Design a binder for this molecule. Structure first.
Ligand SMILES: CCCCCCCCCCCCCCCCCC(=O)OC[C@H](COP(=O)([O-])OCC(O)COP(=O)([O-])OC[C@@H](COC(=O)CCCCCCCCCCCCCCCCC)OC(=O)CCCCCCCCCCCCCCCCC)OC(=O)CCCCCCCCCCCCCCCCC
Ligand SMILES: CCCCCCCCCCCCCCCCCC(=O)OC[C@H](COP(=O)([O-])OCC(O)COP(=O)([O-])OC[C@@H](COC(=O)CCCCCCCCCCCCCCCCC)OC(=O)CCCCCCCCCCCCCCCCC)OC(=O)CCCCCCCCCCCCCCCCC
Ligand SMILES: CCCCCCCCCCCCCCCCC[C@@H](O)O[C@H](CO[C@H](O)CCCCCCCCCCCCCCC)COP(=O)(O)OCC[N+](C)(C)C
Ligand SMILES: CCCCCCCCCCCCCCCCCC(=O)OC[C@H](COP(=O)(O)OCCN)OC(=O)CCCCCCCCCCCCCCCCC
Lengths: 174, 121
């Protein structure tokens, strides 16, 4: 369906085997499926057709808000309240977007496990690696900021991480 | 006494001539309205103490209460605003005249400032 993006939410092609009956006995599942189609599917399809006809007469649109980029807390001067405000709001929006990214990856993982069923350990290794990488990066970014997290605290954590990486590189080169 | 003995201060002068250059309080000032409210409360308490009908009796007396409170409040607000303007003027002049005491400092961005990170866990 065009409701969502297939590239963002991938689904493997569906391979349904053709029925190969070996007995003359009638299939109760087939008979009940025919009954369900006759009694339920047709009336609900007619109702949805009427509703969609009524919708098409009043077609109106809504838009997605776009935020232009602004200088971040690194560029802001010390105790420059306006630049700090803009940078903090931008960091909070980025935090929300990153959280939704992790949510999308987790949904991929869950859906793939359920779809694979009994062979999930081998067939879901591709989605497990992506989740591992994304969770690792997200944890390193926002792991222990606290209840009163802020762009300044995230920047301080990044500075500490960069100093540690530089020290490790120097020690390895020594 | 901080602003007592300030040069050029005329004694026993509620409002000097140099205060005439400031914007007078608006008559609809929230502080003036609160002074009127205090006057009305005083009138109601007067009626209650003298055992007259609190909201009905003594309308002329209540009006005088409100008017007197608003009058004194207007003059008090003028004096308060003048004194605060005087304080700001003196502070700015002193900062201007003592640059070695109030030096401009180079502003370092948070990219250059190093702050310790304390994790919450
Ligand atoms: C009865 C009296 C009212 C009758 C009806 C109105 C008649 C006058 C109409 C008129 O002239 O209107 C124009 C005028 C509009 O003013 P403006 O020029 O547009 O404002 C722009 C200013 O330049 C700038 O305005 P601003 O927003 O910057 O205001 C500065 C504000 C900034 O102040 C603050 O930030 C702090 C304010 C609180 C300080 C103290 C907190 C701790 C003490 C709590 C209370 C203790 C005692 C109890 O500081 C002050 O106002 C200083 C005095 C603080 C108290 C002000 C109270 C105003 C109303 C007076 C009557 C109150 C009666 C209460 C009980 C009623 C019972 C029936 O309207 C008013 O002033 C009406 C105010 C509301 C009246 C109705 C009662 C509301 C009570 C609210 C209580 C909680 C707050
Ligand atoms: C209204 C909200 C006020 C909020 C707070 C603001 C500050 C206070 C208000 C100013 C003072 C008001 C008058 C005080 C004395 C009242 C005496 C009395 O009986 O009053 C009944 C009186 C009517 O009765 P009446 O037929 O004349 O005479 C009955 C006898 O007095 C009957 O005599 P009785 O022998 O039966 O009296 C026995 C009674 C006598 O009891 C009293 O007299 C109690 C009231 C006076 C106590 C002290 C009042 C506050 C004085 C300042 C202290 C700080 C206040 C803020 C405190 C904050 C923290 C608590 O004693 C007891 O019940 C003893 C047991 C209780 C003792 C423990 C509780 C004590 C509470 C003290 C604090 C109360 C604060 C709130 C104010 C309550 C009264 C309004 O009603 C009023 O005075 C109502 C208030 C005025 C309404 C004006 C409405 C004007 C038109 C509409 C205007 C609309 C807004 C404007 C804009 C335009 C819009 C279109
Ligand atoms: C051409 C001639 C024109 C003459 C025009 C008249 C000029 C002014 C005349 C003043 C009246 C004549 C003298 C009578 C006594 C004067 C008292 C007053 O006017 O003096 C002022 C005094 O004003 C009062 O101090 C302010 C009164 C404030 C009342 C409220 C206090 C604030 C309380 C905070 C909560 C308020 C709640 C609401 C209150 C209603 C300043 O005098 P000052 O020489 O400098 O004081 C020296 C002492 N110091 C230095 C320690 C201060
Ligand atoms: C009668 C009983 C006693 C109570 C009387 C209450 C009213 C007293 C004032 C009467 C009017 C005086 C007047 O002319 O006020 C006008 C003035 C604002 O006018 P001005 O600023 O020039 O114009 C607007 C500019 N943008 O307005 C001001 O400066 C306002 C200052 C006074 C604020 C008073 C706040 C309310 C006090 C309580 C009133 C309750 C009345 C209840 C009456 C009950 C009667 C049964």
């Amino acid at each position: 369906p065009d409701s969502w993006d297939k590239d963002v939410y991938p689904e493997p092609p569906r391979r349904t085997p053709a029925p190969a009956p070996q007995t003359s006995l009638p299939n109760p599942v087939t008979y009940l499926t025919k009954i369900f189609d006759l009694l339920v599917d047709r009336p609900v399809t007619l109702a949805r057709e009427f509703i969609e006809q009524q919708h098409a007469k009043n077609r109106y649109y809504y838009y997605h808000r776009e935020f232009r980029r602004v200088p971040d807390i690194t560029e802001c001067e010390e105790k420059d309240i306006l630049c700090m405000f803009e940078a903090e709001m931008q960091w909070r929006r980025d935090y929300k977007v990153d959280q939704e990214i992790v949510n999308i990856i987790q949904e991929r993982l869950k859906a793939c496990q359920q779809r694979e069923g009994e062979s999930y350990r081998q067939n879901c290794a591709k989605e497990l690696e992506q989740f591992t990488q994304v969770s690792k990066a997200f944890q390193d970014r926002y792991s222990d900021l606290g209840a009163h997290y802020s762009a300044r605290k995230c920047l301080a954590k990044q500075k500490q991480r960069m100093l540690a990486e530089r020290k490790a590189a120097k020690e390895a080169a020594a | 006494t901080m602003m007592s003995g300030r040069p050029g201060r005329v004694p026993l002068q509620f409002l000097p001539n140099e205060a005439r250059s400031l914007p007078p309080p608006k008559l609809t000032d929230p502080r003036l309205v609160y002074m009127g409210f205090l006057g009305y409360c005083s009138g109601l308490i007067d009626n209650a103490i003298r055992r007259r009908p609190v909201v009905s009796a003594g309308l002329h007396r209540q009006l005088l209460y409100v008017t007197s409170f608003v009058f004194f409040g207007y003059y008090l607000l003028k004096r308060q605003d003048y004194m605060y303007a005087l304080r700001d003027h003196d502070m700015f002049a002193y900062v201007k005249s003592h640059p070695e005491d109030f030096p401009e400092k180079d502003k370092k961005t948070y990219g250059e400032i190093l702050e310790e990170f304390h994790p919450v866990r």
